[PDB]
Amino acid sequence: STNPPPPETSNPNKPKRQTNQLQYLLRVVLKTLWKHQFAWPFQQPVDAVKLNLPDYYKIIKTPMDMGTIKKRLENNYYWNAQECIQDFNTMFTNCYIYNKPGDDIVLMAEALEKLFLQKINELPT
Length: 125
Ligand SMILES: COc1cc(C(=O)N2CCC(N3CCN(C)CC3)CC2)ccc1Nc1ncc2c(n1)N(C)c1ccccc1C(=O)N2C
What we know:
With 125 residues, the protein is mainly α.
């Protein structure tokens, strides 16, 4: 079995920026989720080989995870906050697509997403 290459975290052709909102996304939003007790499944790409999920990447064609997001933020990969917020949303969405209501992993995602929403509610404007 094989995992796909992970999402890129640097791109020499992609314009870079660090806005005050992107700084907040790294230093407040990502940091807060990363330290949460339920962060661990989301700190790296889904390893479909080690988790024995042979259909994961048949179903999920836009993978995302907080390890990737963290590196993107550290590299100033994003131009704007919305790109980063979209990556968080993709990560959560993938979990809900692949898994089922009431699954432990879904409950964990929901708790993290609630915290995510609380923190981005106060993005500096
Ligand atoms: C750090 O990477 C992982 C480690 C482990 C793992 O074996 N352990 C050791 C045991 C440990 N538990 C010990 C018992 N304790 C009560 C809770 C903690 C948790 C960590 C398990 C999963 C890991 N990564 C992981 N990535 C993405 C997933 C996913 N899993 N889960 C939960 C999924 C499982 C099935 C299908 C999909 C997923 C999934 O969507 N994601 C995001």
